[PDB]
Ligand binder design. Structure first.
Ligand SMILES: [Ca+2]
Lengths: 412, 395, 209, 33, 96, 48
C-alpha cells in the first residue's frame, strides 16, 4: 500500500526584466541673413517587465513515498494530481528522476533523514517544466494552496528464474490489484505512530464451489496484524486491540451487514460476525485508556479508585456513588484535534442518570440513562491552543452505577 | 541471435509439421521411445500404428535442414546406454571413485554403440540453470550433412536431431561442475549404411552393387554356388556345424565350402553396412522350453546380459541375413534378433541380386566369422518381450 | 555501499548584455517672407541588461563516487538531491555521461589522481541544464550553500559460468537490497583513513524453521 | 464497456504583456552673435 | 491519383528542405532543379507451404549485387512501355 | 541454413584488425583503376 505526501511547493515566476541607459552629444550651427552655436548633452534611463499569460510561473513540489502493506515494491512509479481550487492543474507520472528503487514495508522513499524529492517536470524525458496561468498565479498569491492526490502507483515484485536469481522485470502488481481487491476485505489498524493496511480473503456464500476457509472478524484481525492472545483478548504489541478497548469505524454497507448479522448472532459481539467481501473496517486505538485491571496511561489519576468489586466488562468496575475527577494538563494534547471521550456504563438497578460534564473549549453537560447491560456513550471534545487551560472531565452521578473501559481517542 | 534463426526455420514448415512439433513438445518421451523401436514389427503393423504419422512428419522436418560443417553438440547420457549397468554415483553423491572410473573405462574400451532415436541436444556446454540428470557428459562431433531442427520451447532455443549412426568414445576425464564430479567423454560418429524398414531402397542399392557380380563369377562356380543356395545350403551348414572336416573328413563337401568361400571373397561389400537376422535358441545354446527363453521376467534378461554382453561369438557355418529389419512370418517365434554391422571391405554378397527367389533380401557372410557383442537391449512385442543384440563383425 | 560526495559547485549566471553607439548628420534650410542654413551632427551610446526570473542561473556540481562494501558495482548510476535552504531544487539521476563502469571496494570514481566529474544536465539525453530562480540566486549570493544528498544508487553485478564468462547486463543489485537488509545486522568500522561497512546474517528466534 | 466523461474545461489565454517607463535629462548652451 | 509530396529531410518528417539566397536567385532566374534516384530499398515476400507470406527482414539489397554480377541486362523499349530484364550468363573460364 | 542471404549483424570491423595483422598489402596502380589486396604471410617464429 503505497501513497505520496507533499511537503512543500515552490513557485518560479517567469518574468523578463530589462534596464537601459544612454547618453548623447549634439552640435548645431545656424547662419541667418548672423551665427549661433548650440551644444546639447543628454542622458536617459529605462526599465521593463514582460509577462506571458499562458505560462506565468512554474511549480516544483517536494514529495515522499510511504509503504504500509506487507510487501515491498520495486521501481515505484506513482501518478498524482495537482489541484488548486476545483481545477486539476496537471497529472504527472513519475519519470526516472522520481522513481524509487526499493520501498520496504514501513519504510519511506527517500529514507528517513533525507530531504524530499523534487517533482518539477511533466514530459516523458524530464525536459519541460510545469506551468500555470496568470489567474492561477493570482490565486496562489491570494493565499490558496495546492493539494496533491495520488491516483495510482506502478511497481514490481520479485520471483526466481530457472536459476536462483531474483527477477523483477515483467512482474507487475497491476495484474493482481483488481483480483485481490475483488475477493478480499480491507482492515486497517491506525495506532499512533504508524498505520497498517491489510487485505484478508473472504468467502463467497453464493458460490457452492468456493472452498476458501471461513473467518470471523476477530480471527481475520488476528491473522492480519499478527496479534497475540493473552486472556481471550488481542494485543498488537502491547496495546489491547479488543473491540471494547478501541474505536471501530465502518462504512455504511459494513455497518448494515454487521447490524443484520448481530440480531441473529448468539454472543452478540462484533468480533464474532462472519467476514464478507467488500468490508471496510478501521481500528483506531485510543490515546489514553484505562480498564481498572492492568492498563493505565493517563498522565493524571482518577479521584475514585476502588477496584475491589469483581464486576464490569473484564473483572473490574472501579465506580461508586462518589465523583470521578481527571485533569488533563493540556500539555499532552495536540493543538487542533477532534477528540472523543468514550466508555461503558451500566445500572444494575433503575436509578438516576449521570451528569457528564466536559470542559475543554466550552463546558458541555449531558446526561445518559444506563440500561441493565453495558452500552457506550462516546461524547466528544476538542483542544484549543496547546498552551491554554487544562482539560476537565467530571462524571457526576449517583445510584451506585458502574463504569469500565474509559478511553480518549482523537480523529480528524 | 537464435530466436530469428528459429523463426526463419519454423516459418517455412508445414502446418502438419508444426502440430507434430507441438505434440512432441507436449509428450516427447513416448514419441522418442516409439522412434527407437519402431522398425522391428511386421510390415502391416507399422503401417496401422497411431503414431507413425507423427514419426514421419518429425523426421521430414528434421531432415529438411542440414549442416555444412562438422560441429560439436553437448548432452547428458545415461551410462547404461553404453552397457554399464552399475552406478557411477548416486544423484545425491558429490564424488566419483577411482574404481568406478576404471570400471567404466574398461567397459567402453573398444566398442561401437548405436543410437537410433530422437534426441534433445544443445550447441553450448551446460552452464548454471541447465539440467544435469546424469553423471556422464558427452562431447559428440556430428558429421557433415546431418539434420538439426532448432525450435523455441518456452523462450529456450532447443535443438532436435535424429540418431542413425554408431558412436565410439575416444577419451574420458573427470571434471567438476558446481562442486559435483562428472565423467566427460569425447565421442565421434562412425558412419554406416542402414536401411531400417524401407526394404525398397536397400534392394535397389543391392541390385545396383551386385547385379554385375554374377558376371565376374566364372560360369561353372556360378552355377555351383547357385545350386548350393537353392538346394544344399542346409546340408552344407549342417555338415559344418558338426565339425565335419575334423571329425569325418571328406573332399566332396570341402569342395563346396571352398567354392562358396571363394565366390563370396571375389567381391566384398564396398561400404559399411548393417544387417538384421533373427536368431534361434540353439545358436545361444538354449532350448525353446528353457525357462531363460522367457524374457518377460527381469532376471532372465539380467542373466543373459551378464553372461553374453561384451563377449565374443563364433559361427562355424554360414550366416543368413536380411537388409530389412521388419518381422517375417518365417521367424515370428524368434525372440532374439541380431543386429550386425559389416565393416567396409569384408567378404560378402547380395544373394537377392540374381533373378528368381534367391531369398528375402538375403546377404551371406563367410563361414567361421567371429562377432563381438557390444550392447543388448529389450523391447516389447505384444504380449511378449523380445531381445535385441548389437554386434560388430571382426575380420 | 556506494555514496556520492560533492567537491565544489559552479554558478553560471544567465544574463543578456547589449551595447550600442550611433552617429547622425542633419541639414536644414528655411526661406521666410530671409534665408538660413543649419548644420547639425551628433552621436549616442547605449547599454542594456536583460535577466529572466524563471531561470536566472545554471549550476554545475563536481562529484565523486566511493565504495566501502565487499563487492564491486558495475554501471554505477546514483540519484542525488540538491538542497539550498529547505528546498530540494532538483533530483537528478546520473545520465550516460556520469556513469561509472567499474567501482571496486575501497576505490573511487573517478580514480584517485583525477579531477571530479561534472553533473550539469538534468534531462534524459543530457541536453538540458539545471536552472535556479532569482530568489535562489540571491540566497546563494548572500553566502548560503547547496548540499548534496544521495538517495539511491543503481548498479550491476557479475555472474560467471563454467568457462569464466562474466555477464553484468540484467543483473541488478536493487533486487537484493531489501532482502539483504531485512535479515542482516549492519556493522561499521571507522578507523582513521578508511571506512568499512558490512552486513552479517542474524538468526530469527521466533521462527522454529 | 469503457467511456469517458468531461467535467470541466480550462482555458489558458496566450498573451504577451509588457510595461516600460523612462527618464531623460538634457542641457543646451546657445551662443548667438 | 496525384503525385506525393517530398518536403522533409529528417527521419521524423519535422524539418523542411532549405536553400540559400544564391540558389533562390538561380531558381528565380529560370534555372531548374533535377531529380536523380540513387538507390531504392524494398522487400520481397516468401510464401509458406500453407500460403503464408512474410516480407519483414527480406531485403533485395542482399541480392542486387549478386544478380548484377552474374547476369546480362536487356531492355525492350516499346511505345508507352519499357521492360528491363536480367538473364544469367555462363562463365567459360570457370570449368565448374 | 534456410538458404537465403543475410547481411544483418555481419560486420567487417570484426575482421579488419585480424586480417591486417597476418597479411601483406600489395597495390597495383595502372592508369585508370587501382587494386588493393591482402595476402596471408607466414610467421617463422611460430613452429605451429
Ligand atoms: Ca475492566
Amino acid at each position: 500500500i503505497v501513497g505520496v505526501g507533499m511537503e512543500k511547493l515552490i513557485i518560479s515566476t517567469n518574468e523578463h526584466a530589462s534596464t537601459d541607459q544612454g547618453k548623447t552629444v549634439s552640435r548645431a550651427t545656424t547662419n541667418s541673413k548672423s551665427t549661433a552655436v548650440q551644444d546639447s548633452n543628454g542622458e536617459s534611463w529605462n526599465t521593463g517587465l514582460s509577462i506571458n499569460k499562458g505560462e506565468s510561473a512554474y511549480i516544483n513540489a517536494n514529495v515522499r513515498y510511504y509503504n504500509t502493506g506487507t510487501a515491498p515494491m520495486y521501481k515505484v512509479t506513482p501518478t498524482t494530481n495537482l489541484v488548486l481550487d476545483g481545477d486539476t492543474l496537471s497529472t504527472i507520472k513519475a519519470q526516472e528522476n522520481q522513481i524509487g528503487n526499493n520501498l520496504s514495508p514501513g519504510d519511506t522513499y527517500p529514507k528517513k533523514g533525507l530531504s524530499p524529492l523534487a517533482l518539477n517536470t511533466m514530459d516523458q524525458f524530464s525536459s519541460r517544466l510545469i506551468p500555470i496561468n496568470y489567474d492561477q498565479l493570482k490565486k496562489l498569491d491570494a493565499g490558496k494552496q495546492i493539494k496533491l492526490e495520488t491516483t495510482q502507483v506502478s511497481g514490481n515484485f520479485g520471483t526466481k528464474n530457472s536459476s536462483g536469481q531474483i527477477v523483477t522485470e515483467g512482474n507487475s502488481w497491476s495484474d493482481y490489484i483488481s483480483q485481490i481487491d475483488s475477493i478480499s476485505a480491507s482492515i486497517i489498524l491506525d495506532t499512533e505512530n504508524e498505520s497498517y493496511e491489510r487485505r484478508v480473503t473472504a468467502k463467497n456464500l453464493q458460490d457452492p464451489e468456493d472452498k476458501t476457509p471461513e473467518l470471523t472478524i476477530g480471527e481475520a484481525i488476528e491473522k492480519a496484524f499478527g496479534a497475540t492472545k493473552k486472556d481471550g483478548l488481542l494485543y498488537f504489541n502491547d496495546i489491547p486491540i479488543d473491540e471494547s478497548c478501541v474505536e471501530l469505524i465502518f462504512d455504511d454497507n459494513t455497518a448494515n451487514k454487521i447490524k443484520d448479522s448481530l440480531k441473529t448472532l448468539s454472543d452478540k459481539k462484533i468480533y464474532n460476525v462472519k467476514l464478507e467481501r467488500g468490508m471496510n473496517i478501521l481500528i483506531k486505538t485510543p490515546t489514553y485508556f484505562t480498564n481498572f485491571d492492568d492498563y493505565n496511561n493517563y498522565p493524571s489519576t482518577w479521584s475514585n479508585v476502588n477496584t475491589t468489586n469483581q464486576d464490569g466488562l473484564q473483572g473490574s468496575a472501579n465506580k461508586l456513588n462518589g465523583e470521578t475527577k481527571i485533569k488533563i494538563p493540556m500539555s499532552e494534547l495536540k493543538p487542533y484535534k477532534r477528540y472523543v471521550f468514550s466508555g461503558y456504563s451500566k445500572d444494575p438497578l433503575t436509578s438516576n442518570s449521570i451528569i457528564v460534564k466536559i470542559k475543554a473549549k466550552e463546558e458541555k453537560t449531558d446526561y445518559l440513562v444506563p440500561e441493565q447491560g453495558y452500552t457506550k456513550f462516546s461524547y466528544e471534545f476538542e483542544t484549543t491552543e496547546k498552551d491554554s487551560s487544562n482539560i476537565e472531565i467530571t462524571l457526576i452521578g449517583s445510584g451506585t452505577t458502574y463504569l469500565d473501559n474509559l478511553s480518549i481517542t482523537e480523529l480528524n | 541471435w537464435e530466436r530469428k534463426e528459429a523463426e526463419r526455420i519454423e516459418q517455412k514448415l508445414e502446418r502438419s509439421e508444426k502440430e507434430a512439433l507441438e505434440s512432441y513438445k507436449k509428450d516427447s518421451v513416448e514419441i522418442s521411445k516409439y522412434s527407437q523401436t519402431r522398425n522391428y514389427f511386421y510390415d502391416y503393423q507399422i503401417e496401422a500404428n497411431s503414431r507413425e504419422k507423427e514419426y514421419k512428419e518429425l523426421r521430414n522436418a528434421i531432415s529438411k535442414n542440414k549442416i555444412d560443417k562438422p560441429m560439436y553438440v553437448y548432452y547428458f547420457e545415461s551410462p547404461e546406454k553404453f552397457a554399464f549397468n552399475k552406478v557411477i554415483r548416486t544423484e545425491n553423491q558429490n564424488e566419483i571413485s577411482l574404481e568406478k572410473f576404471n570400471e567404466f573405462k574398461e567397459t567402453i574400451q573398444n566398442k561401437l554403440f548405436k543410437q537410433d532415436g530422437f534426441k534433445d541436444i544443445s550447441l553450448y556446454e551446460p552452464g548454471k540453470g541447465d539440467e544435469k540428470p546424469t553423471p556422464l557428459l558427452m562431447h559428440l562431433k556430428l558429421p557433415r550433412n546431418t539434420g538439426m531442427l532448432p525450435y523455441t520451447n518456452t523462450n529456450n532455443v532447443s535443438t532436435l536431431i535424429e540418431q542413425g549412426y554408431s558412436i565410439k568414445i575416444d577419451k574420458i576425464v573427470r571434471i567438476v561442475i558446481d562442486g559435483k564430479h562428472y565423467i566427460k567423454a569425447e565421442a565421434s560418429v562412425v558412419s554406416s549404411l542402414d536401411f531400417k524398414d524401407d526394404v525398397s531402397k536397400g534392394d535397389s542399392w543391392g541390385k545396383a552393387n551386385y547385379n554385375d557380380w554374377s558376371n565376374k563369377l566364372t560360369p561353372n562356380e556360378l552355377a555351383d554356388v547357385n545350386d548350393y543356395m537353392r538346394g544344399g545350403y542346409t546340408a552344407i551348414n549342417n555338415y559344418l556345424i558338426s565339425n565335419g572336416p575334423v571329425n569325418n573328413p571328406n573332399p566332396e563337401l570341402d569342395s563346396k565350402i571352398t567354392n562358396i568361400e571363394n565366390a563370396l571373397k571375389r567381391e566384398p561389400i564396398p561400404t559399411n553396412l548393417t544387417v538384421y537376422r533373427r536368431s534361434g535358441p540353439q545358436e545361444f545354446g538354449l532350448t525353446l522350453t528353457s525357462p531363460e527363453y522367457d524374457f518377460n521376467k527381469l532376471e532372465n534378461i539380467d542373466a543373459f546380459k551378464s553372461k553374453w554382453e561384451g563377449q565374443a561369438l563364433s559361427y562355424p557355418n554360414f550366416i543368413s541375413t536380411s537388409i530389412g529389419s521388419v518381422n517375417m512370418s518365417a521367424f515370428a517365434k524368434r525372440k532374439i534378433v541380431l543386429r550386425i554391422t559389416i565393416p567396409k571391405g569384408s567378404p560378402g554378397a547380395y544373394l537377392s541380386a540374381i533373378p528368381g527367389y534367391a531369398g528375402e533380401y538375403e546377404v551371406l557372410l563367410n563361414h567361421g566369422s567371429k562377432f563381438k557383442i557390444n550392447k543388448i537391449d529389450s523391447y516389447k512385442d505384444g504380449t511378449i518381450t523380445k531381445l535385441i543384440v548389437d554386434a560388430t563383425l571382426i575380420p
